[PDB]
Design a protein around this ligand. Structure first.
Ligand SMILES: [Mg+2]
Ligand SMILES: [Mg+2]
Ligand SMILES: [Mg+2]
Lengths: 285, 115, 152, 59, 217, 111
RNA sequence: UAUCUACUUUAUUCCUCCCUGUACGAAAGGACAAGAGAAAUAAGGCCUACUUCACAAAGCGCCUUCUAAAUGAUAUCAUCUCAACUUAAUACCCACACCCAAGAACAGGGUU
């Protein structure tokens, strides 16, 4: 037989285990709030040509955002929920071209994971995240594994690339999937467009302007549309577009640290062109 | 969207418009790559057996928000060189003609009203 | 693609699914316990609890009496819904029904279910009990609860 | 030392290695020099692989 | 109490925190600009800056004929005919180039959406541009104006006779035959009014939203 | 700056043949100043068009948008719009038939 | 009424504008490039609004789209040299039961 966690517990012991395990998840998330009062890794300044970490965010939904020129910009919200660095692998052990950081988001039940994963997070000292994405990264940006990543890792004005599974449409035919509808060739070429399973694949939207970040609720407000349904987990990295490869001067280079306590951030950073709520009604004079 | 074959309500003080005729004036060609015209496009137009260039001033399918939407396909005639046939335009004209690239300054001197 | 489509499509149309569910709900107000196939039962379970929430709006309410007049095809059950079922559940705010699975139907092997209304005169169902608090694992966890209470 | 091979004559510039990704329009002819800059094993590897008897013991 | 429809979410499996954020921005706009109570019958005049004129504003007056949209991006479209021409504008309620929204004549019509006014007589859609805002008294319910309008001939915008529209502001007796009426009662769906799983109860939603309103004060 | 005074400088400095401007009131949300000016011929109107866009372009106002001359191919009419003002270079016969000076003073009080 | 083979997720263009009415020409004439725009198509997404509609799916809607020189031998000059010398892919992906934005079945995600 196979079991589940709840199977042999009495009526008395089920909310006891809920309060116990939930409280250890809150304590483990609370202990990691001081990365710099811990012993971090050596923080380097930004060098031209270095890459830093990305994030994993919920897609909250969309809302409009008017700029000072009186144009709408549809904006997805992306909440950062319990994002943390999980493992650093150098380039020598990776046998890739570059070092890698594994980062995971959205705490998920301990009662529903493989035991290799629970041993991993147990040794690491964290409640297990839903997704773990991997970031190609230079040696200069390498935060210690077990450190929180926040919304202000990105700043307004920055352009960003977001990857998520697209909304799966299940098995679709040619007209919806591909949008249409030789003799001597006695066969159908590979990559021919035929009916099949549409969606539920990873796609990346490239070069999306960050308009506004909300430091309190940890929201990123990104231009336009991101792949995936609502409440989906997206991987938010800095854009690879070569028109945007050098603007890492002003971005906090390892990551943003509220523990650093230096010139703390407001409620919500806005881009310069954003009409804030509470500003007087804009006139084009 | 004013495509081919659409009936067109000409708003002018022109001789061609306000003349009575057995056929309603209807579009023939739209001067975009796709054959769909919006507020501030040029079309060919059949009036009294005479094809004639024309400029779309407001249509019935909704555009962006703060812009107006008419209950007819109001169209102002124009000549080949670019100056309009008309002298007065009675029905209101959207200000969205101002930003678009093309001949619009000539028409905005003629409007009685602006919406 | 049926994302967020919440209703089973049943019977031979929307009208016919509402008449199937209305017959099941009438059966369950009358007999207070029903075997029926499973998908039909949980569709109708949604409707059943709402029907009591209209029963608590009072006999004298006009809207409640319209809903009861539609949903109960036998008209003698409308005094029952406003004087037996709605006074029974006047304390608790939800959870008026319980649904379990029967073994599959002998005829065509359909997934079967029972719903009853809670607190009826009928012999009780063999409800799935949790394991006893005096078992080995439950006593280890009881001891652990005693230690974490001893922390204060 | 298979980076340090030595073709005789103009075989660096004339000899062509043609492959096909099975997709349409996926025919890829690449000279010996370009393929030797991609991977400095593949020229000796393709030579040997052509010399061996065309059967199942080959791989 | 009147809670404007843009605060009530449509049901859906989105996260309540997103509406916490939206309502925060919506109230922060309602500090600057005064958004009044108005229904789907009322005559409005809106002053907007123009993106095409250099900081000149404008006024449009008409009937709010629809209050669609929820959240910060919510709209209302008002209608008027001028110069023998019908015009409608979709106004975004929280677009920061609107300066004032004055309610000329607060009144509620029989329907929730007066889109049938596109097919009525143009006298039911025309209004004075310089008309004066009628004074309402502070402590009173709204005047529910009923006005069964008269309809222009049969090829309408939509078949308003059909009972999925539930149109009340029509004198159907003047402009429709009894045979076509009884034909229109084919698409009735009488059960649809009586199912209890389609009914979205916004009551506790209203509670948390009114504590959002009071807490922003 | 590039005001209407500077426009009078550009046109009397060109010796435009005929000048008549209207201050458009701010409600009629097209422009502020509505210049009606005629010249000799197509060469004259054309050259004074390129002159006034030459002087506005060369003068100041980098952040302000570059301005396209409208109706370069037509003969009688020409028109150029700025932020505050819009000039119409045309012919006095064309002025006679389009009667613009009546329109922007009589918005509903003419034919 | 599909048995077998094969197969079923490998950014362009137009117009405008500027640079510039400069370069070049001597006058007529008149650039490139790069930049900003607006469009359109294709590709990939998405639903905040609008529209068909309404716990969602859509488009008519929105978002994104990255051989030529010098030098110089044969043939002491020269000569672009089937003469020699010198010079001009990143991204993506990677660990029972119930509900599901996952789904034909199987699979997948969630169940604190
Ligand atoms: Mg063959
Ligand atoms: Mg069936
Ligand atoms: Mg229609």
């Amino acid at each position: 037989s196979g079991t589940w966690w709840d199977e042999h517990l009495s009526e008395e012991n089920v909310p006891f285990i809920k309060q116990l395990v939930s409280d250890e998840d809150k304590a483990q998330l609370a202990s990691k709030l001081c990365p710099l009062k811990d012993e971090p890794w050596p923080i380097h300044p930004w060098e031209p040509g270095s890459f830093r970490v990305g994030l994993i965010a919920l897609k909250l939904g969309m809302m409009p955002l008017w700029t000072k020129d009186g144009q709408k910009h549809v904006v997805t919200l992306l909440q950062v929920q319990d994002c943390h660095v999980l493992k650093y692998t150098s380039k020598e052990n990776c046998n890739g071209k570059m070092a890698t950081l594994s980062v995971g988001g959205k705490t998920v039940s301990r009662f529903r994971k493989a035991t290799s994963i629970l041993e991993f997070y147990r040794e690491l000292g964290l409640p297990p995240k839903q997704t773990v994405k991997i970031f190609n990264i230079t040696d200069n940006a390498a935060i210690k594994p077990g450190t929180p990543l926040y919304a202000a890792h990105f700043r307004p004005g920055q352009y960003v690339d977001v990857t998520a599974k697209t909304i799966g449409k299940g098995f679709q035919g040619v007209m919806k999937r591909w949008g249409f509808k030789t003799g001597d060739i006695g066969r159908v070429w590979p990559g021919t467009k035929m009916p099949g399973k549409m969606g539920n694949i990873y796609r990346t939207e490239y070069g999306l302007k960050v308009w506004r970040i909300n430091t309190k609720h940890n929201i990123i407000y990104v231009n336009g549309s991101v792949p995936g349904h609502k409440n989906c987990l997206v991987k938010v990295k800095d854009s690879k577009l070569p028109a945007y490869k050098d603007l890492g001067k002003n971005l906090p280079f390892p990551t943003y640290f509220p523990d650093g306590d230096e010139e703390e951030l407001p409620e919500d950073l806005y881009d310069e062109n954003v009409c804030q709520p509470g500003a007087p009604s804009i006139t084009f004079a | 969207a004013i495509q081919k074959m659409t009936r067109v309500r000409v708003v002018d003080n022109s001789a061609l418009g306000n003349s009575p005729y057995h056929r309603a004036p209807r579009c023939i060609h739209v001067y975009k790559k796709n054959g769909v015209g919006k507020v501030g496009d040029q079309i060919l137009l059949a009036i009294k057996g005479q094809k004639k260039k024309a400029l779309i001033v407001g249509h019935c399918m909704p555009g962006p928000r703060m812009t107006p939407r008419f209950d007819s396909n109001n169209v102002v005639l124009i000549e080949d060189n670019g100056n309009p046939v008309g002298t007065r335009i009675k029905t209101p004209i959207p200000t969205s003609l101002r930003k678009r690239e093309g001949e619009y300054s000539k028409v905005l001197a003629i409007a009685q009203n602006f919406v | 693609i049926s994302h967020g489509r919440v209703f089973r499509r049943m019977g031979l149309g929307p009208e016919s699914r509402i008449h199937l569910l209305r017959n099941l709900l009438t059966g369950l107000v009358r007999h207070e316990r029903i075997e029926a196939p499973w998908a039909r039962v949980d569709e109708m379970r949604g409707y059943a609890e709402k029907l009591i929430d209209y029963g608590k709006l009072g006999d004298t309410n006009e809207r409640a009496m319209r809903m009861a007049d539609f949903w109960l095809t036998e008209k003698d059950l409308i005094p029952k819904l406003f004087q037996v079922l709605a006074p029974r559940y006047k304390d608790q705010t939800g959870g008026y029904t319980r649904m379990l699975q029967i073994p599959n139907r002998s005829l065509d092997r359909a997934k079967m279910a029972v719903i009853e209304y809670k607190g009826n005169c009928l012999p009780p169902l063999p409800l799935p009990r949790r394991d006893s608090h005096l078992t080995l694992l439950n006593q280890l966890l009881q001891g652990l609860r005693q230690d974490l209470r001893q922390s204060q | 030392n298979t980076r340090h091979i030595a073709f005789s004559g103009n075989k660096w510039e004339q000899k062509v290695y043609s492959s096909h990704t099975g997709y349409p329009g996926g025919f890829r002819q690449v000279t010996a020099a370009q393929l030797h800059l991609r991977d400095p094993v593949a020229i000796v590897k393709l030579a040997i692989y052509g010399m061996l008897p065309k059967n199942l013991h080959r791989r | 109490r009147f809670l404007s429809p843009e605060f009530i979410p449509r049901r859906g499996r989105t996260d309540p925190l997103k509406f916490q954020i939206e309502r925060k921005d919506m109230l922060e706009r309602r500090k600057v600009l005064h958004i009044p109570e108005f229904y789907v019958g009322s005559i409005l005049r809106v002053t907007t800056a123009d993106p095409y004129a250099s900081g000149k504003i404008s006024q449009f007056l008409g009937i709010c004929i629809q209050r669609s949209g929820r959240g910060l991006g919510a709209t209302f479209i008002l209608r008027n005919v001028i110069e023998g021409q019908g015009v409608e504008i979709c106004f975004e309620l929280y677009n920061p180039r609107v300066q004032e929204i004055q309610v000329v004549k607060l009144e509620k019509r029989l329907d929730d959406s007066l889109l049938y006014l596109r097919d009525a007589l143009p006298e039911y859609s025309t209004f004075d541009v310089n008309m004066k805002p009628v004074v309402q008294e502070p402590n009173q319910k709204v005047p529910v104006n009923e006005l069964k309008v008269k309809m222009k001939p049969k090829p309408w915008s939509k078949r308003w006779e059909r009972p999925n529209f539930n149109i009340k502001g029509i004198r159907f007796d003047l402009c429709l035959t009894e045979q076509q009426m009884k034909e229109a009662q084919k698409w009735n769906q009488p059960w649809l009014e009586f199912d209890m799983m389609r009914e979205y109860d916004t009551s506790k939603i209203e509670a948390a939203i009114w504590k959002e309103i009071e807490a922003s004060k | 700056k590039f005001d209407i005074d500077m426009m009078v400088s550009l046109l009397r400095q060109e010796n435009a043949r005929d000048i008549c401007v209207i201050q458009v009131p701010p409600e009629m949300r097209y422009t502020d100043y509505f210049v009606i000016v005629s010249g000799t011929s197509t060469r004259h109107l054309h050259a004074m068009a390129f002159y006034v866009v030459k002087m506005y372009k060369h003068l100041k106002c980098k952040r302000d948008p570059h301005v396209k001359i409208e109706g370069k191919d037509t003969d009688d009419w020409l028109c150029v719009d700025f932020g505050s003002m819009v000039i119409h270079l045309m012919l006095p016969e064309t002025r006679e038939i389009y009667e613009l000076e009546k329109l922007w003073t009589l918005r509903s009080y003419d034919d």
